Design a protein around this ligand. Structure first.
Ligand SMILES: [Mg+2]
Ligand SMILES: [Mg+2]
Ligand SMILES: [Zn+2]
Ligand SMILES: [Zn+2]
Lengths: 589, 589
DNA sequence: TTTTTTTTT
């Protein structure tokens, strides 16, 4: 009685956006340029434009969605006749559905309607192909006829062959022809509920989702997604009777989003502040009093340096931080905060991790008994940050397994006839206690740290934390009580804004070293070697790795302000911060 | 529709190459003489000759390849009728398809089209036979009739059996006749995407390819290959239902490449320069400052000596290098460069390797329940170079498993009722750290190395690296910053040219030892042994292996300049580099 | 059972 085809077309071409620019017109034009085949529509925009259509989509999705897709194809076809013979149909995906249901609250009444689920991806299968319109040939000396079996109907998820030949009305043997068969991409993924939603005592539950067409390979394991689709029951062998009338639940995903223009201007406005570096540093772990030098160092690791890829070798651009401190110095507190503000981070512990789990594991699947590779903690953290708490408690024979990944950023496995190399370009932040629990001033620094010199040289910065009860006890006590009383600090950038700022900086900023910065870095490195050679007693070594640490830190400081060149000011800060690092380990420069 | 037989024949007989030598005419003559039954055609040559013909091959590949093959067969048969009765049919393989698609980005729209994928070979199955035209026999008291079941059609991939006997129009059961059955060679291989195209935080994907006819055994595992063919879906168990309407994809290989006259000309003129040895040495790891003695030693291992095979025993011709140094001395960077410039190299680490994974692994095939052998890292590196980083970090029980492979170049396995002996003719390059991380000058050499004398004697050269800060820090710092600034050293042979030069030398050069070099080597070996007895406390021993090392090094120097004999000059260089090895380890000369 | 990599008494 009522047709929404004109309404949908009117909404797409007449919708004044936030800036009154008809954003959906631009989105359509962007789709035509690269043949995206998929259009994303905000549910709120549909509700704002015409409410009546909004309930039709959310309640009658299985019928109205194909109608809208056909209307969209005609409009695009008129705009660009050449859109044919490369894309045969388009997809309309809806996001922002208010029907959000927890993974553990799914019941029978929720099956058959469009719902949204928030969770964590844990497993992705390789992309495969699914038949939705097959072609068969009747193997009978009379027929030799070709036909499509699922006539006037999309082929069901359960394969079925015809029993009577449509063109001859006879049974027999039918042969499938892959050449005339129509296929669609098919991928299976497993989603898991967030730890914040898991109830006390029980383990988290999992749900199976299916991605098809261009939705395949839209996310990687470990990501946080918001999948929207229709729930349905899953069957494997319906022909195989013998009870077992109980079925699982799987979701047919229609739209997926992971974790905008308005963010860019907000980010750009922040970088215009001359004191942006101080604001960022003061925004790291606002609940922790003091430790300004530690907060500044942790900010550098979040941004990192510029990796160099050459025709013969490649240079690591990540920054590694090591912290040694007495118990109660809150070392585990900023580590938790770092794992929260970083766009991608993995949190591990020295005791709860092994060498195989840190880098890669070779396991035998019982399905075939064939060995295959399993990604480790450092591999899954590629492009992000790996946090290793209580590193001193880790077994030494297991700790040496990360020496290659800390510098060469690769993992090499030669086990059971498997030879492979995996990228592990991740920043490593580690914390631990001294040899005797607390730091002892009488003993030398060498036996207090209790770490081999090989792993110490791989850390760009090393800070030693000492809990000395002094005058600042009253200041610290008042700060802690204020936190427990609900009092908070203002003019601190929020985590969500800070996380967006870091991600933008790591993607569009690549500082370059200037001549002025080169001279300052070169002079200071020479001063290190002369001082180190004078006293061959410190447990740390001034290797050429330290020179490259200066370069990486200088780039991080420039990247913190979204600068394109490493000026003298950034070089001075890089020199200054390492002076504190050398002072902590007892080297007086 | 215009016939392409005349154009194809005209193209073959009239195409002019770089020298207008009618290259494809020569290929046909080579094909006739050797009965190669296969022709390789470069796509760009076809496009230059006739663009319309090139387009037809790309798109109408299914129906035009047999047409061109038939025309070529008649031309060859006319050229030499003796070619018939020896070769039933020929194959036309097209190389140089502009359509290249990554392994991970294969979609449904690419099925049924000629595409090219470049990857790494992993697994190769033994050659088997496939039926493409069966011959059954309807046994029944009245029939006694035999027939070719697939009439006017090639036998499908699925083994199908006739239901009604064509000769009598009656049902029953049929018996296959192997004698009259036509067969074709069949092989299954697995290809993997290159590590440089795998997305961050994800494991590499795999694709299944099928090789038939002369394409079998065209490559070995670990090779980089470029395959062109048609993608198709894979059917495994279609007899039983149970849904599973999702299918994997495999590739029907049409042409395969691995990894010329012009290149040989370029190599020949390079050796004409009297300072070719210095140019090659200076081109090893251009991003590393200093370490000239290590650069020279690494170049020698790339070329190696001349293996000797006698009627009663064989002598290895590979050079083994061991490097011990303080952390940060760029030991790993040189090893990474070696693994990239060598024609065939395998990179492993001490911690990520096992005894089974390095030599050979015995694995039980779950399909049949019987044990079988899997090639280790050393076996896969036969005829190449094996790199073992962090040699001191592996357990001594596992490190001792390579004693036989490092000297006898064989691997002996007596496990699970399997007795075998596999060739492991590979050069071993190892690096490691001293016992206490950094070298201690006050302590002797015996406790610093912390390696058994047995494995030490198997290394041709051993170099000890010490990181002593001094007057060279400023020049070292300037060199590193220039690398980070994008500046590159000129007058350096590129990796691609250097790799070609090494491969040619290892294949066509076999130097001989003259009388002048014989006397020099004998005198030095006697003098070296005499000084060894003076100080028997050194962990290194002057075994007769060191005499063989001098011969191998002398041959490598001659092979570096493409010489035919080991002159007096090459003997001096071998002695000079040996003196540095002895001096570095603590033995004066 | 027997060979292998892995976490676990
Ligand atoms: Mg803690
Ligand atoms: Mg190293
Ligand atoms: Zn029929
Ligand atoms: Zn019959």
């Amino acid at each position: 009685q009522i047709d929404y085809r004109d309404v949908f077309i009117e909404f797409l071409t007449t919708f004044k956006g936030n800036n009154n620019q008809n954003k959906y017109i631009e989105r359509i034009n962007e789709l035509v340029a690269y043949r995206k085949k998929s259009l994303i529509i905000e549910f709120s925009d549909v509700l704002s434009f015409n409410e009546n259509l909004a309930y039709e989509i959310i309640n009658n999705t299985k019928i109205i969605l194909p109608i809208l897709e056909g209307a969209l194809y005609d409009h695009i076809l008129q705009l660009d006749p050449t859109y044919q013979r490369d894309i045969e149909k388009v997809h309309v995906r809806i996001v922002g559905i208010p029907r959000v249901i927890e993974l553990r609250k799914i019941r029978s009444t929720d099956i058959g309607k469009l719902i949204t689920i928030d969770g964590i991806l844990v497993k992705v299968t390789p992309v495969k192909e699914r038949i939705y319109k097959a072609t068969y040939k009747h193997i009978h000396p009379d027929c030799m006829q070709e036909f499509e079996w699922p006539e006037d109907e999309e082929m069901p998820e359960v394969l079925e062959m015809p029993t009577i030949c449509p063109k001859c009305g006879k049974p027999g043997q039918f042969r499938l022809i892959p050449e005339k068969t129509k296929l669609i991409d098919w991928q299976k993924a497993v989603i898991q509920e967030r730890p914040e939603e898991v109830p006390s005592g029980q383990l988290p539950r999992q749900l199976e989702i299916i991605l098809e067409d261009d939705l395949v390979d839209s996310a990687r394991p470990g990501d946080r997604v918001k999948v929207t689709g229709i729930l349905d029951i899953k069957q494997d062998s319906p022909v195989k009777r013998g009870s077992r009338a109980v079925f699982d639940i799987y979701m047919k995903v229609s739209s997926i989003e992971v974790s905008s223009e308005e963010d860019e201007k907000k980010i750009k406005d922040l970088a215009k502040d001359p004191w942006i570096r101080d604001r960022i540093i003061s925004s790291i772990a606002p609940s922790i009093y003091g430790h300004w030098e530690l907060k500044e160092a942790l900010a550098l690791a979040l941004f990192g340096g510029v990796p160099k890829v050459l025709e013969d070798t490649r240079i690591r651009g990540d920054i590694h931080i090591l912290i040694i401190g007495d118990p109660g110095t809150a070392k585990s507190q900023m580590l938790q905060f770092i794992s929260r503000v970083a766009p991608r981070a993995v949190y591990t512990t020295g005791k709860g991790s092994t060498a195989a789990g840190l880098t890669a594991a070779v396991v035998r699947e019982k399905g075939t008994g064939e060995y295959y590779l399993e990604a480790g903690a450092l591999v899954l953290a590629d492009g992000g940050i790996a946090v290793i708490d209580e590193i001193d408690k880790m077994r030494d024979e297991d700790r040496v397994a990360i020496h290659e990944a800390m510098e060469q950023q690769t993992v090499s496995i030669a086990k059971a006839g498997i030879v492979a190399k995996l990228n592990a370009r991740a920043a490593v932040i580690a914390a631990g206690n001294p040899k005797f629990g607390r730091y002892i001033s009488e003993r030398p620094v060498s036996d207090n740290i209790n770490l081999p010199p090989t792993i110490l040289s791989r850390f760009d910065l090393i800070f030693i934390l000492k809990d000395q009860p002094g005058e600042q006890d009253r200041e610290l006590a008042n700060y802690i009580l204020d936190v427990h009383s609900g009092k908070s600090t203002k003019n601190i950038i929020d985590i969500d804004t800070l996380r967006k700022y870091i991600a933008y900086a790591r993607k569009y900023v690549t500082p370059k070293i200037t001549s002025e910065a080169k001279n300052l870095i070169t002079d200071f490195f020479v001063e290190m070697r002369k001082k180190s050679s004078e006293t061959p007693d410190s447990p740390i070594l001034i290797t050429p790795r330290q020179l490259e640490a200066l370069i990486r830190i200088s780039e991080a400081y420039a990247k913190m302000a979204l600068k394109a060149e490493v000026t003298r000011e950034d070089a001075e800060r890089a020199i200054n911060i390492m002076r504190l690092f050398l002072e902590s380990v007892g080297v007086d420069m």
